[PDB]
Design a protein around this ligand. Structure first.
Ligand SMILES: Cn1nc(C(=O)N[C@H]2C[C@H]2CO)c2ccccc21
Ligand SMILES: [Zn+2]
Length: 140
């Protein structure tokens, strides 16, 4: 579990969105595993606007933040799961690290701010849904 709270937006993994998220929908994209809903209170997170390929992610199954090197956001083949058929996920970045399904939602961050959230993994690899290109998270 986990979300990014920036301005009046809550950014969560689309496959973990609640009924309340769907009833206050702002934007969703299945190919990116992302859903954004509106909030009452303002959020404290800032979105990174950079091209960092090194950062730190939160791993709930270890209660630890790990430094990682990660690939540039791309279209990657992701295996069938209880949430999606075996399809290509877009804007996905890969790093060598520990993760389990419930680690989804952990923030990946750099010196500039929040870069993305845990979305895929298995076998020593963790994948993050990039959010740096979503310039509209900073305004409105
Ligand atoms: C971080 N993480 N996430 C998933 C996962 O199954 N996510 C579901 C949304 C769909 C994408 O494949 C996973 C599995 C096994 C180890 C790690 C994992
Ligand atoms: Zn950065």
């Amino acid at each position: 579990s986990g979300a990014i709270y920036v301005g009046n937006y809550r950014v969560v993994n689309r496959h973990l969105a609640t009924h309340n998220d769907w009833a206050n929908l702002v934007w969703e994209d299945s190919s990116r595993d992302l859903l954004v809903s509106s909030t009452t209170a303002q959020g404290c997170d800032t979105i990174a606007r950079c091209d960092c390929q090194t950062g730190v992610y939160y791993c709930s199954s270890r209660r630890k933040h790990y430094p990682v090197s990660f690939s540039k956001p791309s279209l990657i083949f992701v295996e069938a799961s209880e949430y999606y058929p075996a399809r290509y996920q877009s804007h996905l970045m890969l790093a060598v690290g520990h993760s389990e399904p419930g680690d989804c939602g952990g923030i990946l961050r750099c010196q500039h701010g929040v870069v993305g959230i845990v979305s895929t993994g298995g076998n020593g690899l963790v994948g993050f849904a990039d959010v740096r290109d979503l310039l509209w998270l900073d305004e409105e």
